[PDB]
Enzyme design. Structure first.
Site, PDB file in Angstrom:
ATOM      1  CD  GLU A 775      -4.201 -10.146 -10.345  1.00  0.00           C
ATOM      2  OE1 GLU A 775      -3.191 -10.437  -9.966  1.00  0.00           O
ATOM      3  OE2 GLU A 775      -4.525  -8.936 -10.550  1.00  0.00           O
ATOM      4  NE  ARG A 853       2.277  -4.116  -5.853  1.00  0.00           N
ATOM      5  CZ  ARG A 853       2.122  -3.661  -4.371  1.00  0.00           C
ATOM      6  NH1 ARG A 853       2.904  -3.607  -3.704  1.00  0.00           N
ATOM      7  NH2 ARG A 853       0.573  -3.394  -4.368  1.00  0.00           N
ATOM      8  CD  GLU A1234       0.843  -9.452  -3.523  1.00  0.00           C
ATOM      9  OE1 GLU A1234       1.486  -9.686  -4.780  1.00  0.00           O
ATOM     10  OE2 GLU A1234       0.147  -8.694  -3.143  1.00  0.00           O
TER      11      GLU A1234
HETATM   12  O1  LIG Z   1      -0.755  -3.972  -6.673  1.00  0.00           O
HETATM   13  C1  LIG Z   1      -1.103  -5.004  -7.058  1.00  0.00           C
HETATM   14  N1  LIG Z   1      -2.160  -5.148  -8.151  1.00  0.00           N
HETATM   15  C2  LIG Z   1      -2.425  -6.519  -8.607  1.00  0.00           C
HETATM   16  O2  LIG Z   1      -3.399  -6.716  -9.390  1.00  0.00           O
HETATM   17  C3  LIG Z   1      -1.754  -7.504  -8.022  1.00  0.00           C
HETATM   18  N2  LIG Z   1      -1.960  -9.030  -8.369  1.00  0.00           N
HETATM   19  C4  LIG Z   1      -0.948  -9.567  -7.246  1.00  0.00           C
HETATM   20  O3  LIG Z   1      -0.831 -10.765  -7.093  1.00  0.00           O
HETATM   21  N3  LIG Z   1      -0.341  -8.748  -6.549  1.00  0.00           N
HETATM   22  C5  LIG Z   1      -0.727  -7.537  -6.937  1.00  0.00           C
HETATM   23  N4  LIG Z   1      -0.342  -6.311  -6.454  1.00  0.00           N
END
Ligand SMILES: O=c1[nH]c(=O)c2[nH]c(=O)[nH]c2[nH]1
Ligand SMILES: Cc1cc2nc3c(=O)[nH]c(=O)nc-3n(C[C@H](O)[C@H](O)[C@H](O)COP(=O)(O)OP(=O)(O)OC[C@H]3O[C@@H](n4cnc5c(N)ncnc54)[C@H](O)[C@@H]3O)c2cc1C
Ligand SMILES: NC(=O)c1ccc[n+]([C@@H]2O[C@H](COP(=O)([O-])OP(=O)(O)OC[C@H]3O[C@@H](n4cnc5c(N)ncnc54)[C@H](O)[C@@H]3O)[C@@H](O)[C@H]2O)c1
Ligand code: FES
Ligand code: FES
Lengths: 1304, 49, 98, 49
Positions: A775, A853, A1234
């Site tokens: 990412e 999170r 996820e």
């Molecule tokens: O809320 C999230 N933001 C992210 O930038 C991200 N990247 C990820 O793998 N899961 C999540 N969840």
């Protein structure tokens, strides 16, 4: 001679200047351009590089076939063999059955492991056209897959087994015709009738002699004792690649008949030293089948060890002699050879001697008593005599293809007709710098009777004799010591049983039947799997594939090795290679850099540093990172610079010639270091609701404690890779990148170069996995490479080696939690306070969003009226941690389930009852004030609890536990709630671009990247429904910043939701344009409307876009919706632990998952299974270890043990919830990537339950609410099962001494 | 015409799904794409000019 | 582009349509996977046809930015764009002309 | 176009054209062409997919 001659897929290769350092993998990929065979690790642990070898075996006089790791096979070892790769068995025009079945059965997601697995299965079929299920699973001991969760691969391949709505139809699989396999090259059959002559190969640095006779070998060893023997290269290859050792003269003796012979003598069986263990295995197997049990005790000990010795690829070429002479402290064979006094024959020119392996064979670290001119000729493995009994033991982190923590051989000989000890031998690996015998313990037991006194004597002795220094390499000191005693105990009981079967029960006594389970050899039942999903309506068009199990669009290509990943792209003739140069200190000033040695390496171009950056050296998501280190380094792995050379070999060598001088600065490593030094990324994050004072005062009970959760390496099978291609005009550059984030790649490159974004194009075809690891952290390679390309005006490439990748790119955040929970006697929770700490490493990256999170999920499934959570992100001198599938949710929710487990135990109530009565209901508000609508969790719960027969199974578990003292079962059912949408609202957007060409074919692209999750497949399904045309007329080729700009990362499980809507809108625009032509010719085909629109000058191109509405949470005001909707699911898992070793079996898992109306049930079940197994690794197997100075020890599959084929629940049931459409996402689907991952906590808590049973059994006093940190590894499980063995092994940590590792 | 640059094509096969990228000195990308795709027997959507 | 300065003209056009300097607009290439079904660059008419197309794509972008312009009529181009991006407004458009 | 770097695996093509305004092709002999170092293949109408 000196020409190297072999065949690849039937084509003759004549290599006139073979270099001994060239591996087959490099030769296939770089010289021949056959890129189906992949690099996954370079150290033999992943099997991504698996290929088949055929040869005429002169000794057995027949054509043979075996599998090898191409990453470790020197091409100079391969004269006159025939290599077959994935390209050699079939292609998309004519798939081999193996390729067809893995593709059609949903066994290929990211596809990077698929060729290797194909070739393992292919090789098995060439040797055994009708394998057993067990032989099939065995074929893959040396193959890893990070995506699939393994179930579909085995299920598809089960169709080959002699002993054998739906996701696929095996009835449609084409039959195997073995006459259609490739001919063995006729030339090699012709050449079989010529004497082998000695060959000599000369490389840049290394000379290789392939010796044809014993005479030539002994002569060479006499005149040049320095000549390094190489047989399988499975140790030397590692020493060379990973420990930078160079042996300038090698001799390969593999051809010499004397070293390959098997002779049956009166005392046992003698194996030539170069015999592969595959041959040892088949010889001892047959011997064990046909000879009396009394004589095969030692044979069976060896076989037991070989079960858990690497895999088929390694054992095909690894030699018995090689294992012996390597003299690893953790040899699995040497303890057995030593315990059995196996007879070794040594030779040199004009000398022959025989020795018995005993303690003196292994004097020091990696030494034997061989003279430098001597080679090992043979080893006689002995028959066992009457009254002679043998056991071999190994405990590692994972059963299959792992390295021993402790490994042992144990032998006893009884005086005849007695229970009196004549001989006793107890030998261990992993307890010293060498294979050791317990010489001080063992002689004291001579003449004793095999009884409780001997048991107690030996255990006291072993505990004193086998001391370990707190600083002992490998750590886990208490566990290792416990294992020596635990192994002896199993041996003790086993011998009681063996005495028994020799009619001496009366003398030694019988085994208490609740002890019998202790002595069983590992056996795992054949798998039983269930996949339940919903049929689409009977009315739905056969061309509308939405909700149908359409296989991944690239599956066939992935199985055939035709699918192109970044490094499979052909190099430009002028292309250069880049190697990163990284800090070897956690925190230091860079004093100076000396490139003098690097410049001497042939093909060296330049060494890039901060000064070479044209514009800005400030990068990373919060602009707090360097492109290249300036003045100071802030972690081990901090990128200082980059070497550019002509080849990767020359870039690696040059990089070793970059000498850096440092001056250490105070280092902040651990969460505690950070708390004490007040070193944090920003301020405290907090969510609070209700009244905490009131709640605690009202509570009947209050429990406090802490939980540590270890981090996680992504282990995408394809590591980070970028090619940057400079265009020579106006700053234009194109990058081909394995990344989930084209936009940030583009931005970061542009800013570094000082050019506008419109000059930089980033393209992603596909990734071999990402999982959050790509990412952001992909950009540390992309920017380096971009700069090289800019500077040189030439294309430049860098793919990371696994060790590099694992060191630089970071992982899941370790978490430390301190909790206090208040609850009533009924189990109702009335108050909760949790402080969270994460270790973020040396840049902010996504750390703060990950903490948010975690806080958003500290409730898990539970309504808590008075609650307070805090998070703090620690800033440390470690690599920067980042996104990993779950993104803080798993950590948040494990803490919740951990205190929840203690609530249940404290109340003395069943955990499932306590969970259920605390569960939210429909319309409830969360702790962050979002309303739970379409709350399906209770349905998921009831279905799972019913289909898994949880209550009946409880009864069986209780019964098992009352009837077995040294094995225990546990059973747990865990729910989950997972909020869907990025925590940063504006990232909830996506774009698409669609073209219709005048032939009617559609070219679609969107912002999402394919990383094996089947995103493109889903978008094609979506577009096909939206346009009402078959999927066959729509194609997606790639993702690119110059087709769809300003794209969010493929992350937060969101990408099908966002890009699905974009695609849908783009498609609606096209349909609006074709309406008038549809109206004029309503049945006339799609092709006619399109041509009509074109000749009417109507645009056939459209953008589409979507933003998720109504999002935006405020921490100030604890209001606003962070999430668009929630995912829900439940898993029930059963385990059986080994209380003496800490090993366990995952007996059964049942999952009910709410995926709304699945866009694709085959892909979605695959995502459930894949996610679940990554969670299984996180919570029970996967562990990173760091030196006290913050250097990552764990840098490859050898030490980092992800789930293997043999890890998954034996019984593995997945149901997608029926009849639960989710209005507010594309075609009533829900995101899946996820949310399932956390449900593997069911295995964690099932282990925790079994451990509780073990403590009730043998504890005395035992702390109730004992500690179980994550991961619950064999170490943690075993240490927690306190008993008479652990009690005799505990104590130490003398103050603040040095130790191998520190908890970060 | 005596354009100083004569006609020139580079064709790069991608090995997936008949995909091919062409770098061409042409005033007519569309007919290039169409004629390549018809000759090969693949849809226009696989061919980029 | 075959030396007739067509990209030069289209940049000039786009710069007027968007009311930003030509320095901030770039054309790299022509490609069938960015604009499909194109007529040959022929009949002298390519600036006429592509200029209208470019103009229309520019007008769409402007229309999308005008709420951000109204809210900050002085604040620079870069602020309107970033504001649009962080309000999740599309910054990609096709244009077409017959 | 021709200024683009070649891939290390890139091949070269050369068209073979008629030396007659109007004729039947009676036969084609590639036997000398096959002797040239680096020769790969001669494409004709029969090669068109
Ligand atoms: O809320 C999230 N933001 C992210 O930038 C991200 N990247 C990820 O793998 N899961 C999540 N969840
Ligand atoms: C993925 C993987 C998993 C592994 N798992 C295990 C495991 O579970 N347990 C375990 O014990 N090992 C393990 N190993 C180590 C290795 O596979 C074995 O030690 C193997 O037996 C080495 O044999 P080889 O023929 O490949 O040796 P090579 O690497 O060719 O040689 C190794 C050493 O032996 C010497 N040598 C070889 N033959 C002779 C001879 N006849 N006389 C004198 N010297 C000789 C060489 O000079 C060299 O010093 C593993 C390795 C890998 C890559
Ligand atoms: O081959 P390889 O690289 O996989 O293994 P290696 O030679 O790197 O040795 C690693 C392992 O050997 C054992 N070991 C080495 N020195 C030791 C000591 N002094 N005391 C106790 N154990 C020790 C430990 O079990 C350690 O984990
Ligand atoms: S790349 Fe060869 S085993 Fe992993
Ligand atoms: S599909 Fe196996 S590693 Fe990705």
């Amino acid at each position: 001679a000196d020409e190297l001659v072999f065949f690849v897929n039937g084509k003759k290769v004549v290599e006139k200047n073979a270099d001994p350092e060239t591996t087959l993998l490099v030769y296939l990929r770089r010289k021949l351009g056959l890129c189906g065979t992949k690099l996954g690790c370079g150290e033999g642990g992943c099997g991504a590089c698996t290929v088949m070898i055929s040869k005429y075996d002169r000794l057995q006089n027949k054509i043979v076939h075996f599998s090898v790791n191409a990453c470790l096979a020197p091409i100079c070892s391969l004269h006159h063999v025939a290599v077959t790769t994935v390209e050699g068995i079939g292609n998309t025009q004519k798939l081999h059955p193996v390729q067809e079945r893995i593709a059609r059965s949903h066994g290929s997601q990211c596809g990077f492991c698929t060729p290797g697995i194909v070739m393992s299965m292919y090789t098995l079929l060439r040797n055994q056209p009708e394998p057993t299920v067990e032989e099939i699973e065995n074929a893959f001991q040396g193959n890893l897959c990070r995506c699939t969760g393994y179930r579909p691969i085995l299920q598809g391949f089960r169709t080959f087994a002699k002993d054998g709505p739906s996701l696929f139809n095996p009835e449609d699989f084409k039959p195997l015709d073995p006459t259609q396999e490739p001919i063995f090259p006729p030339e090699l059959l012709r050449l079989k009738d010529t004497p082998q002559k000695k060959l000599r190969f000369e490389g840049e640095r290394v000379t290789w002699i392939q010796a044809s006779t014993m005479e030539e070998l002994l002569d060479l060893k006499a005149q040049h004792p320095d000549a390094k023997l190489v047989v399988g290269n499975t140790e030397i290859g590692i020493e060379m690649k990973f420990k930078n050792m160079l042996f300038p003269l090698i001799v390969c003796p593999a051809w010499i008949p004397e070293l390959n012979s098997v002779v049956h003598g009166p005392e046992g069986i003698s194996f030539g030293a170069s015999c592969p263990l595959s041959l040892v295995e088949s010889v001892l197997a047959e011997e064990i089948a046909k000879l009396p049990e009394q004589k095969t005790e030692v044979f069976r000990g060896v076989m037991e060890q070989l079960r858990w010795f690497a895999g088929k690829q390694v054992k095909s070429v690894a030699s018995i002699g090689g294992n012996i002479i390597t003299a690893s402290p953790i040899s699995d064979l040497n303890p057995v050879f030593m315990a059995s006094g196996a007879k070794l024959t040594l030779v040199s020119r004009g000398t022959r001697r025989t020795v018995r392996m005993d303690h003196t064979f292994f004097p020091g670290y990696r030494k034997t008593l061989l003279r430098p001119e001597e080679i090992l000729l043979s080893i006689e493995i002995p028959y066992s005599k009457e009254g002679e009994f043998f056991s071999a033991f190994k405990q590692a982190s994972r059963r299959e293809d792992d390295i021993a923590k402790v490994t042992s051989g144990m032998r006893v000989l009884f005086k005849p007709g007695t229970i009196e000890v004549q001989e006793l031998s107890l030998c261990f690996g992993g307890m010293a710098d060498r294979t050791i015998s317990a010489l001080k313990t063992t002689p004291k037991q001579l003449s004793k009777s095999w009884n409780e006194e001997l048991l107690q004597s030996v255990c006291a002795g072993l505990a004193e004799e086998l001391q370990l220094a707190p600083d002992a390499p490998g750590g886990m000191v208490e566990f290792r010591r416990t294992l020596t005693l635990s192994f002896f105990f199993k041996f003790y009981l086993t011998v009681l049983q063996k005495l028994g079967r020799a009619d001496l029960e009366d003398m030694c006594g019988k085994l208490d039947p609740t002890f019998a389970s202790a002595t069983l050899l590992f056996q795992k039942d054949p798998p039983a799997n269930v996949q339940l999903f919903q049929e689409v309506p009977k009315d739905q068009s056969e061309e509308d594939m939405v909700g149908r199990p359409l296989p991944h669009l690239a599956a066939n290509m992935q199985a055939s090795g035709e699918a192109v990943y970044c490094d499979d792209i052909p190099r430009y003739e002028n292309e250069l290679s880049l190697r990163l140069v990284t800090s070897t200190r956690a925190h230091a000033k860079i004093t100076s850099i000396d490139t003098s040695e690097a410049k001497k390496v042939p093909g060296f171009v330049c060494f890039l540093t901060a000064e070479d950056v044209p514009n800005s050296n400030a990068t990373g998501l919060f602009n707090d990172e360097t492109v290249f280190a300036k003045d100071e380094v802030t972690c081990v792995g901090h990128i200082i610079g980059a070497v550019v050379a002509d080849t990767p070999e020359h870039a690696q060598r040059a990089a070793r010639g970059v000498k850096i001088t440092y001056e250490d600065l105070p280092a902040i490593i651990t969460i505690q270091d950070a708390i004490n030094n007040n070193s944090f990324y920003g301020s405290e994050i907090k969510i609070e609701k209700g009244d905490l004072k009131k709640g605690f005062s009202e509570a009947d009970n209050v429990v406090s404690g802490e939980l540590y959760i270890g981090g996680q390496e992504h282990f995408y099978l394809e590591t980070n890779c970028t090619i940057a291609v400079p265009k020579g005009e106006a700053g234009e550059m194109e990058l081909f990148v394995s990344t989930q984030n084209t936009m940030k790649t583009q931005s970061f490159v542009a800013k570094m170069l000082g050019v506008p974004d419109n000059r930089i194009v980033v393209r992603v075809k596909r990734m071999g996995g990402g999982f959050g690891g790509k990412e952001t952290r992909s950009t540390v390679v992309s920017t380096a490479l971009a700069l090289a390309a800019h500077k040189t005006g030439r294309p430049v490439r860098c793919m990371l080696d696994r060790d590099e990748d694992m060191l630089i790119t970071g992982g899941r955040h370790p978490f430390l939690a301190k909790y206090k929970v208040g609850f009533m006697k009924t189990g109702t929770v009335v108050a909760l306070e949790v402080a969270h700490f994460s270790n973020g490493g040396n840049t902010e990256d996504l750390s703060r969003s990950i903490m948010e999170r975690a806080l958003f999920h500290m409730d898990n499934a539970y309504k808590i009226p008075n609650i307070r959570g805090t998070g703090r992100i620690c800033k440390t001198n470690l690599p920067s941690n980042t996104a990993f599938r779950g993104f803080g949710g798993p950590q948040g929710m494990l803490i919740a389930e951990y205190w929840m487990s203690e609530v249940a135990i404290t109340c003395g109530l069943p955990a499932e009852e306590v969970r259920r009565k605390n569960m939210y209901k429909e319309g409830d508000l969360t702790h962050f004030n979002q309303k739970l609508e379409g709350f399906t969790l209770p349905r998921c719960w009831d279905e799972c609890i019913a289909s898994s027969q949880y209550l009946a199974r409880k009864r069986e578990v209780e019964k098992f536990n009352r009837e077995n003292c040294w094995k225990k079962r546990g059973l747990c059912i865990i729910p989950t709630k997972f909020g869907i949408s990025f925590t940063l609202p504006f990232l909830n957007q996506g774009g698409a671009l669609v073209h219709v060409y005048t032939d009617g074919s559609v070219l679609l692209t969107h912002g999402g990247t394919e990383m094996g999750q089947g995103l493109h497949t889903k978008m094609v399904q979506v577009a096909s429904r939206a346009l009402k045309i078959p999927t066959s007329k729509i194609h997606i080729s790639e993702t690119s910043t110059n087709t769809v700009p300003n794209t969010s990362p493929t992350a937060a499980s969101a990408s099908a939701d966002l890009n699905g809507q974009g695609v849908y809108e783009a498609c609606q625009t096209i349909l609006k344009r074709l309406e008038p032509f549809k109206k004029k010719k309503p049945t006339g085909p799609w092709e006619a409307w399109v041509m009509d629109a074109y000749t009417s000058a109507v645009s056939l191109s459209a953008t589409g876009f979507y933003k998720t509405p109504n999002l935006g949470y405020s921490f100030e005001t604890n209001s606003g919706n962070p999430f668009h909707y929630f995912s829900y699911g439940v898993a029930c898992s059963e385990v059986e632990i080994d209380c003496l070793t800490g090993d366990h079996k995952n007996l059964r898992t049942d999952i009910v998952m709410d995926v709304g109306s699945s866009l694709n049930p085959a892909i979605d079940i695959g995502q459930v299974e894949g996610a679940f197994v990554q969670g299984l690794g996180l919570f029970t197997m996967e562990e990173l270890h760091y030196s006290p100075e913050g250097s990552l020890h764990t840098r490859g599959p050898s030490t980092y043990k992800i789930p293997a084929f043999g890890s998954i629940p034996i019984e593995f049931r997945v149901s997608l919830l029926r009849d639960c459409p989710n209005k507010r996402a594309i075609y009533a689907s829900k995101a899946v990537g996820e949310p399932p991952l956390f449900l593997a906590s069911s295995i964690f808590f099932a282990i925790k339950d079994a451990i509780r049973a073990a403590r009730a059994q043998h504890g005395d006093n035992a702390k109730q609410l004992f500690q179980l940190d994550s991961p619950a590894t064999p170490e943690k499980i075993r240490n927690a099962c306190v008993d008479q063995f652990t009690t005799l092994c505990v104590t130490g940590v003398p103050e603040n001494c040095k130790s191998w590792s520190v908890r970060i």
